[PDB]
Design a protein around this ligand. Sequence first.
Ligand code: MAN
Ligand code: MAN
Lengths: 354, 353
Amino acid sequence: MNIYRYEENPLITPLDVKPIHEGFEVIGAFNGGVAEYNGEVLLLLRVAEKPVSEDPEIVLAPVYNAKNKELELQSFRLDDENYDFEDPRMIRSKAKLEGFSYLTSLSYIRIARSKDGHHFTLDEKPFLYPFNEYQTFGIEDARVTQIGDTYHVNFSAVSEFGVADALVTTKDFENLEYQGNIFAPENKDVLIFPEKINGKYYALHRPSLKSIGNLDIWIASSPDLRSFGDHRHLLGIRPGEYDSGRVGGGCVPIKTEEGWLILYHGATEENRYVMGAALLDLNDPTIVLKRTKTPILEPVADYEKNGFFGDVVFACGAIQEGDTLHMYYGVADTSMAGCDMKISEILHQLEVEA
Amino acid sequence: MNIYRYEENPLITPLDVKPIHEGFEVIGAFNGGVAEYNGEVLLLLRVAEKPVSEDPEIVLAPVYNAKNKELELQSFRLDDENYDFEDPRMIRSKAKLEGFSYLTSLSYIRIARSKDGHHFTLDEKPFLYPFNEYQTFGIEDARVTQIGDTYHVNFSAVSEFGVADALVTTKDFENLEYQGNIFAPENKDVLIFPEKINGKYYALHRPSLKSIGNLDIWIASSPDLRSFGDHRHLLGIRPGEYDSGRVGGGCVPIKTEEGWLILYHGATEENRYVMGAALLDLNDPTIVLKRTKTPILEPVADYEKNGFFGDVVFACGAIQEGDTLHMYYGVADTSMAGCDMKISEILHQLEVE
Ligand SMILES: OC[C@H]1O[C@H](O)[C@@H](O)[C@@H](O)[C@@H]1O
Ligand SMILES: OC[C@H]1O[C@H](O)[C@@H](O)[C@@H](O)[C@@H]1O
């Protein structure tokens, strides 16, 4: 791939964003959803914030209480032999390392806007902040699918009841309509297809599974973008390849004349995250036509490396301009970067590699 | 309260069912879904079959290969230091005891019918047998919700992709229409409400969660009984009680004047399964009114306590006749039993507790 990485990268880091909670620091402004509205590019940033502890033997979980509508921090001793703090994103039971009891940060969504696609200014106030019992550990990783006048903003809703996927709709990003949890837990990486397709809407998704099953991309159909069904398996992990550990949807599917172009993220068991691509049949997007054997975007620039577990590029949206794609992506789980590439060139690598 | 366990219990055991796979043994006929059709009671029996090995140091996992349309057997040594065989239902990796690599048996649905509700005759052939790539480890635990002339038959579809819940519709139990996986994995214990309620269909379900969340009953709404949404949390587990380990829907919700009466199963962390009840608002069933504090049915008869997986009662359906409930339930993951109960006495127990 001929990738053009923006000169300004990283576009937005933690130092560009001030914390909205007393005694918290911003640790991430990343995994931004992407829309065009009213002649600007909107990034729907995930801002993650962490309480500072003055006692370094105690770690704080920032939990939103839905009854009182405010944070209520919960303390855990690093010396508590019931827990494992080796993944600094989480407080884990030693008997359940595959999960978590708490996150060490809380996330919400904040908009940043650009005339030129390269220089961003934050909205003054948060866009979506935990508002209910499904979001007590945060709102994460907003994806934005526009269909005509309506923007569909869907996001991870984390609470003690699970990680679910929920939907807000809006025409102006000011008046918001909550549509509930469109996917039951445990799920994320939900990407709504940007048009109705032979009488049905579609969404990619990604069940995370306890008993059996890998971290694989699925797809569901909907008559109304409120209720989903006819769930199918779509793209699975591949041993020995860049997506040997997990896959999930990244950008909104892109209509091309060859199929729906799916820019998805893949990680190895080592947690190196890259973007790859798939092409789905145009009429029935449950059919996979092609898939890449090597990535289209991988961590190589310094700001894309030295995530905690690995180097990460994580693209959660893109603006199409003819054959040019302006791709925005999270980097190292802390910041936002931007790049351009050609759609014709992704299509060509799909053909060459299959 | 009045619990009439049938004189004939267990009604149908493994001894009454011949295995359809050669080299296999029937280890259960259980957790039957319940319908009335053409003047008979139908039980959509889960029949579980286990591949037999003559070498006692070896065990086999049966897998139906959806591509080749045939059964493959994976073998294991009991002494394989990477696997755990302590749960008789599953072959687990030691690094993943919360899950399973393989099941010890393969299930399908087979119908039995009765004129009197007590003596049952099996249809001669299977009714649903693994037919796609979502079902390679079995089809299990069929539930039946009848709306108008349409019977909704939904079930656990187990494969290498997950445990999903899939739906078949029929009007006559002969011509069948596949409707896909109506609930994504990981889920099961999906109970479709028997009518449209203020312009929406509903279903109970039971997400099974890797990272956080308990094995709790949830509910969803639907415009069409094909796509589900607006997922809500509904009934959670209760530490120190009969349902401290997990809860799941049992029977089809039953419309009463006080609300929807939900007969659900509850297990401890030691996997003793009982039945309990709850009551939901009539008009908005996402609202829970009442819940029992003690069980309505517990595994105390010997066919309930002893079997392939002991100390289990697991009701997957019930026929209403006025105030009387003819409830049919799985016992010990081995057999079927029947009992009669009174709705009004379940409702009184809800009001007392
Ligand atoms: O959603 C829960 C949690 O899952 C993973 O650990 C990551 O995606 C985190 O960023 C996120 O907070
Ligand atoms: O659904 C897979 C598996 O899950 C549980 O262990 C039980 O319900 C088993 O009977 C079943 O075979």
